[PDB]
Design an enzyme around this catalytic site. Structure first.
Site, PDB file in Angstrom:
ATOM      1  N   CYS A  77      39.225  47.072  76.029  1.00  0.00           N
ATOM      2  CA  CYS A  77      39.856  46.211  75.040  1.00  0.00           C
ATOM      3  C   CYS A  77      39.052  44.926  74.876  1.00  0.00           C
ATOM      4  O   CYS A  77      38.467  44.417  75.837  1.00  0.00           O
ATOM      5  CB  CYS A  77      41.294  45.892  75.452  1.00  0.00           C
ATOM      6  SG  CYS A  77      42.112  44.655  74.418  1.00  0.00           S
ATOM      7  N   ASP A  78      39.013  44.413  73.641  1.00  0.00           N
ATOM      8  CA  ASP A  78      38.236  43.210  73.348  1.00  0.00           C
ATOM      9  C   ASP A  78      38.611  42.041  74.248  1.00  0.00           C
ATOM     10  O   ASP A  78      37.756  41.210  74.578  1.00  0.00           O
ATOM     11  CB  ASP A  78      38.430  42.810  71.883  1.00  0.00           C
ATOM     12  CG  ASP A  78      37.660  43.695  70.926  1.00  0.00           C
ATOM     13  OD1 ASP A  78      37.791  44.934  71.021  1.00  0.00           O
ATOM     14  OD2 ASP A  78      36.925  43.152  70.075  1.00  0.00           O
ATOM     15  N   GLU A 351      49.878  32.429  73.394  1.00  0.00           N
ATOM     16  CA  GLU A 351      49.646  32.369  71.957  1.00  0.00           C
ATOM     17  C   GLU A 351      50.968  32.493  71.209  1.00  0.00           C
ATOM     18  O   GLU A 351      51.654  33.516  71.306  1.00  0.00           O
ATOM     19  CB  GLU A 351      48.676  33.468  71.533  1.00  0.00           C
ATOM     20  CG  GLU A 351      47.275  33.311  72.106  1.00  0.00           C
ATOM     21  CD  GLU A 351      46.272  34.261  71.481  1.00  0.00           C
ATOM     22  OE1 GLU A 351      45.983  35.309  72.096  1.00  0.00           O
ATOM     23  OE2 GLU A 351      45.783  33.969  70.369  1.00  0.00           O
ATOM     24  N   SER A 377      48.518  31.131  66.535  1.00  0.00           N
ATOM     25  CA  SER A 377      47.793  32.357  66.218  1.00  0.00           C
ATOM     26  C   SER A 377      47.684  32.619  64.722  1.00  0.00           C
ATOM     27  O   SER A 377      46.573  32.737  64.195  1.00  0.00           O
ATOM     28  CB  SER A 377      48.464  33.556  66.893  1.00  0.00           C
ATOM     29  OG  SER A 377      48.144  33.618  68.271  1.00  0.00           O
TER      30      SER A 377
END
Length: 464
Positions: A77-78, A351, A377
């Site tokens: 995952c990023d 976030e 966000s």
């Protein structure tokens, strides 16, 4: 036997198995593959940022306890990429990241830009057989890195982070990239400040026609040549330096020479002639309310000054519920402070998606500015400023603001000012008392104890 041992670090949560392909390639290259797995990100938001530290700590521990000679990291995952790069900076042994593949996140493109990946890794889609072939040939890349001693501190130079901030600026800019690139630079011994991000944003335009506010997706770049073509274009315009060594043994310029350019008729990356914005979105603001710094993406549609009345909230839902009771009025300029959401207050700077969405859904984007010591966000037609330092948990001015105070946000001066006398601000600080840490035991208790402020990337092992 006496062959080099290559740790293969995955961050997996239960489609090919890229790690198994890497193992077979490392073995075929005459090296010894050693696969291991790490926890990662994959109320729940309060564990996200500190998971980056768990990744960096865990991978560093295994790499050093077993003393593997090299590292191949599959973050998956990023969001697992930053902690993966921090672990590489700590061991400083030859390492390479293999991006999972495309599936507006700019950090994978920035990591390839810095040279920690083979060309095309960050833009090649996850489906593609070319992602499989990349891992099939990663063994020889690692062997070349060991032969020529290409270490993360050789690759991740100050100019590499300059290129990374520029590429991120070209694509729109992430405020999270401030946290992660500062922490990644810190892990290799490079001093990277929020003002370095301001300097890039002043000199670099915004060229990517990308959604939510544009037409295209990052996945669309692969079909016009991907990340190498983008670097070729930015090299042609003279905006980035291609002389830095990479994990391939070649410079950036040498890596991308054989790749094809953008097609002439591409409208994803604007020409320098016709930029979407002549300067960067990302702005650093200080002032009496955020003397340690703050971060915000400024489109230009917010206006150049916002003066308003303060209304303060000590948690996210407190604001949403005051909004729903009509306590925030149209025609009035109100500056909303959502505090105690910082690195220690959150904890982990969770976030917040709902404050910006709830203001657009009520038609208040022109009457309401949003300030926090944590993170926002979504996008807002007004001012969205986070990362305010010091955070409220540390007793910064953001904790001392009161309902009815005047606050000014000046985008050209780059200050967020609490319009109260300095004597009064010091009097309020003498009455403020620190609340206890939210967690008295466990991983969040340890994270709160060690984490630095947002202006230092929230590193936990002492900023250099």
């Amino acid at each position: 036997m006496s062959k080099p041992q290559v740790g293969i670090s995955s961050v997996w949560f239960e489609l090919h198995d890229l790690s198994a392909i890497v193992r077979d390639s490392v073995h075929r290259a005459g090296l010894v593959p050693m696969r291991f797995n790490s926890v990662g990100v994959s109320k729940g938001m309060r564990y996200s940022l500190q998971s980056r530290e768990l990744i960096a700590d865990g991978i560093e521990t295994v790499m050093n306890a077993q003393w593997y000679d090299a590292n191949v990291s599959l973050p998956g995952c990023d969001k697992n990429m930053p902690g993966v790069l921090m672990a590489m900076g700590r061991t400083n042994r030859p390492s390479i990241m293999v991006y999972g593949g495309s599936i507006a996140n700019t950090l994978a493109t920035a990591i390839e830009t810095m040279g920690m990946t083979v060309p095309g890794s960050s833009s090649c889609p996850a489906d593609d057989p070319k992602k499989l072939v990349e891992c099939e040939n990663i063994g020889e890349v690692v062997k070349t890195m060991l032969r020529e001693d290409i270490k993360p501190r050789d690759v991740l130079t100050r100019q590499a982070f300059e290129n990374a901030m520029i590429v991120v600026n070209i694509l729109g800019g992430s405020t999270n990239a401030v946290l992660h690139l500062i922490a990644i630079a810190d892990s290799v011994g490079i001093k990277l400040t929020i003002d370095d991000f301001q300097a890039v944003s002043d000199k670099t335009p915004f060229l990517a026609d990308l959604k939510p506010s544009g037409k295209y997706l990052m996945n669309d770049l692969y079909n016009i040549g991907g990340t190498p073509a983008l670097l070729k274009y930015l090299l042609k315009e003279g905006l980035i330096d291609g002389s830095g060594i990479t994990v391939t043994g070649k410079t950036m310029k040498e890596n991308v020479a054989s790749w094809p350019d953008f097609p002439s008729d591409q409208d994803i990356i604007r020409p320098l002639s016709n930029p979407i914005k002549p300067s960067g979105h990302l702005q650093i603001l200080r002032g009496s309310l955020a003397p340690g710094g703050s971060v915000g993406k400024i489109t230009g549609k917010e206006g150049l000054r916002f003066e308003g009345t303060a209304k303060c909230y000590d948690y996210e839902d407190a604001f949403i519920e005051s909004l729903e009771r009509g306590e925030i009025k149209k025609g009035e300029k109100t500056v909303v402070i959502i505090r105690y959401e910082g690195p220690k207050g959150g904890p982990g700077m969770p976030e917040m998606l709902k404050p910006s969405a709830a203001i657009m859904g009520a038609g208040l984007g022109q009457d309401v500015a949003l300030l926090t010591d944590g993170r926002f966000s979504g996008g807002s037609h007004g001012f969205l400023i986070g990362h305010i330092v010091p955070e409220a948990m540390e007793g910064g001015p953001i904790a001392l603001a009161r309902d009815g105070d005047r606050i000014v946000i000046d985008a050209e001066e780059r200050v967020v000012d609490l319009e109260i006398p300095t004597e009064e601000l010091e009097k309020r600080r003498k009455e403020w008392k620190a609340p206890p840490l939210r967690y008295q035991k466990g991983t969040l208790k340890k994270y709160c104890t060690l984490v630095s402020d947002a202006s230092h990337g929230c590193v936990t092992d002492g900023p250099i």
